[PDB]
Amino acid sequence: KCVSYGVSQIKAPALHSQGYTGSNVKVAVIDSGIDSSHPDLNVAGGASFVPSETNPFQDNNSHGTHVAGTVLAVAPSASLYAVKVLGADGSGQYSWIINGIEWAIANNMDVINMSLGGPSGSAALKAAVDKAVASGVVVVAAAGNSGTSGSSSTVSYPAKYPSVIAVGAVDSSNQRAPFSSVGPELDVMAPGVSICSTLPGNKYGAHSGTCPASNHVAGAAALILSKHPNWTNTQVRSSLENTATKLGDSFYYGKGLINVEAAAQHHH
Ligand code: NA
Ligand code: NA
């Protein structure tokens, strides 16, 4: 029975104790959908942009359900939105993802979690995440799982786009997971090793990757906006990046581990 640590590691529970659980914060899980039938997962709304997989509350991959459980473990009162842009196989067209981002914008999502990416992006995709940040949305994305490539950034899109918050993985010891992607694009780190979350069919499992880490930051964003609803995505992002626990060189750790308790008491 996998046991969660990552929530207490970013210091979420300190906010919970003070009554900030992400209430009235719209979090778009732009992923493989969310198994809403999971009794621990409460999904406020959704939309599927996968022509052949038309139910966004049906996660045939399992990845988005894992995302939801972590976002909701960090931010339990957060209105969670199943934006299905990824098929059963966990891949989708950019047009689909863009449609998901477009939707997230259209429906006033406070936070986009895109626990997804790849080696390249597109003008259209950059346009979409930019547009979403211009509209005041906190865009969070996994930095990637490409480890290191010498001096080369291994940070994946859309996380590689300046507008997107790029989230690397540390373990319980704040040690960079060997798989966590690296580059100047790297902003923050968050629990991303053996991360216990919800899986389809009332199941749970540890998963590792910059995706779990991202889900914490998306949750952290939600916690921060539930204390500070009038904070811009800009202020949320600076509060997360500027109060982060310094952990190592920016290329491997960005600013370090997200401390949501510190981020939530930040003075701009
Ligand atoms: Na449910
Ligand atoms: Na970025």
Numbering used by the authors: 2 to 75, 85 to 278
What does the paper say about this structure?
Omniligase-1 is a broadly applicable enzyme for peptide bond formation between an activated acyl donor peptide and a non-protected acyl acceptor peptide. The enzyme is derived from an earlier subtilisin variant called peptiligase by several rounds of protein engineering aimed at increasing synthetic yields and substrate range. The final omniligase variants appeared to have a very broad substrate range, coupling more than 250 peptides in a 400-member library of acyl acceptors, as indicated by a high-throughput FRET assay.
This remarkable A225N mutation almost doubles the S/H ratio (see above), which asks for a structural explanation. The sidechain of Asn225 in the α-helix close to the active site has a hydrogen bond to the hydroxyl group of Ser125 providing a more restrained position than in Pre-1 or Pre-2. Furthermore, Asn225 has H-bonds to the sidechain of Asn123 and the carbonyl oxygen of the non-oxidized Cys221, and thus makes good contacts, possibly rigidifying, with the local active site environment of omniligase-1. The asparagine side chain is larger than that of a proline, but points in a different direction; it is located between the α-helices that the catalytic triad residues Cys221 and His64 are positioned upon and as a result these residues are pushed away from each other. In summary, the A225N mutation could improve the S/H ratio by shortening the Cys221 helix in the same way as the P225A mutation, creating space for the cysteine. The A225N substitution also widens the S1′ binding pocket by pushing His64 and Cys221 apart, which is facilitated by formation of H-bonds to nearby residues and to two water molecules in the S1′ pocket.
